[PDB]
Design a protein around this ligand. Structure first.
Ligand SMILES: O=C(NCc1ccccc1)c1ccc2cc1OCCOCCNc1ccn3ncc-2c3n1
Length: 266
C-alpha cells in the first residue's frame, strides 16, 4: 500500500459511541470520510509491541488484505495512514456487524458465501486461522446481508507440500514425532468452518466442556453423535456436511472446493 503520512483526522471524522473492536495492539473505530460522508472502519494498530518494533506485523496484515482485494467476501482496504506510533488501516464498513439458532436456509446461503471467500483465500495459499463468529461480518442484519471476512492477524501464507517435502529431509532419518505430527494447513480452516456450521444450525458449541481441559479433550477424542434434539428439524444433508468437516485427521477433511459441491449447498 501507499502509506499516507498526512494526519488521518484531516480526511475523516471519528464517530462517537462505543468503539467497534479492541484488542491488545489495536482498536477499530467507526468513522466518516469528510469528503463523501461515507462510513468506514478505522483500525488503529500500534507499531511498538512488548517493547519491540512490530511494524512488520501490520505490514503483513495489509499484504493479506491486498492479496484478497478482488475477493468480494473479504473486507476491503481503502487507505493506510501512519504516525510515529500507529499505522491506521481505513477499512470498509460492514453495517451488519458480527453474524452473532439461525434457520437452516439462512445458514445454507451464508455458508456458501463464507466458503467462496475461504476457497479464494486457499486458492491464494492464505490460511486464515481465526475463522469464528466474531470475524464473520454481515453487510446487513435485517434482512441478513452478505458476509465479509475480517481480521487476518493470525493468517499465514503456507508453503506447498513440495516445500514441505524438502523441509522434511531424507526419510530414513525422520523421528517418529515428525511422522505423527499434523502441521497447520488449509484443512485447519475447514475444521473451524465445521464448528461454525454446527453452532449456526443448532446454537450449541459442539466441543465446549465444563472447563478448558475438557474442551481440548473433546476436540481430540469426542465423536459427535449429532442426535441431540436440535438436529430433528435439520436435513440429513446438513448433518453430513458437518461430518465431512469435523474429521479429526486433517487429510480426511473436506476442502472448500468440495464443500461448495456438497449437496447441502446445491
Ligand atoms: O480486524 C478486525 N478485527 C481484528 C482485531 C480488531 C481489533 C484489534 C485487534 C484485532 C476488524 C476489522 C474491521 C471490522 C471488525 C473487525 O473485527 C472485530 C469484529 O467486531 C465487530 C464489530 N462491529 C463491526 C461493524 C462494522 N465493521 N466494519 C468493519 C469492522 C466492523 N465491525
Amino acid at each position: 500500500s501507499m502509506v499516507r503520512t498526512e494526519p488521518f483526522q484531516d480526511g475523516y471524522s471519528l464517530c462517537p459511541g462505543r468503539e467497534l473492536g479492541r484488542g491488545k495492539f489495536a482498536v477499530v473505530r467507526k468513522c466518516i470520510k469528510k469528503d463523501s460522508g461515507k462510513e468506514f472502519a478505522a483500525k488503529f494498530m500500534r507499531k511498538r509491541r512488548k517493547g519491540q518494533d512490530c511494524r512488520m506485523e501490520i505490514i503483513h496484515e495489509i499484504a493479506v488484505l491486498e492479496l484478497a482485494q478482488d475477493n468480494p467476501w473479504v473486507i476491503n482496504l481503502h487507505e493506510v495512514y501512519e504516525t510515529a506510533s500507529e499505522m491506521i488501516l481505513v477499512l470498509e464498513y460492514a453495517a451488519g456487524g458480527e453474524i452473532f439458532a439461525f434457520k437452516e436456509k439462512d445458514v445454507q446461503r451464508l455458508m456458501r458465501q463464507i466458503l467462496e471467500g475461504v476457497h479464494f483465500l486457499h486458492t491464494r495459499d492464505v490460511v486464515h486461522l481465526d475463522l469464528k463468529p466474531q470475524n464473520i461480518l454481515l453487510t446487513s442484519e435485517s434482512p441478513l446481508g452478505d458476509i465479509k471476512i475480517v481480521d487476518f492477524g493470525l493468517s499465514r501464507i503456507l508453503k506447498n507440500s513440495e516445500e514441505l517435502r524438502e523441509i522434511m529431509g531424507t526419510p530414513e532419518y525422520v523421528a517418529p514425532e515428525i511422522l505423527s505430527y499434523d502441521p497447520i494447513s488449509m484443512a485447519t480452516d475447514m475444521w473451524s468452518i465445521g464448528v461454525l456450521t454446527y453452532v449456526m444450525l443448532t446454537g450449541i458449541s459442539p466441543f465446549l466442556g465444563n472447563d478448558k481441559q475438557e474442551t481440548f479433550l473433546n476436540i481430540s477424542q469426542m465423536n459427535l453423535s449429532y442426535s441431540e434434539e436440535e438436529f430433528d428439524v435439520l436435513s440429513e444433508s446438513a448433518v453430513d456436511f458437518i461430518r465431512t468437516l469435523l474429521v479429526k485427521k486433517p487429510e480426511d477433511r473436506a476442502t472448500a472446493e468440495e464443500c461448495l459441491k456438497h449437496p447441502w449447498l446445491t
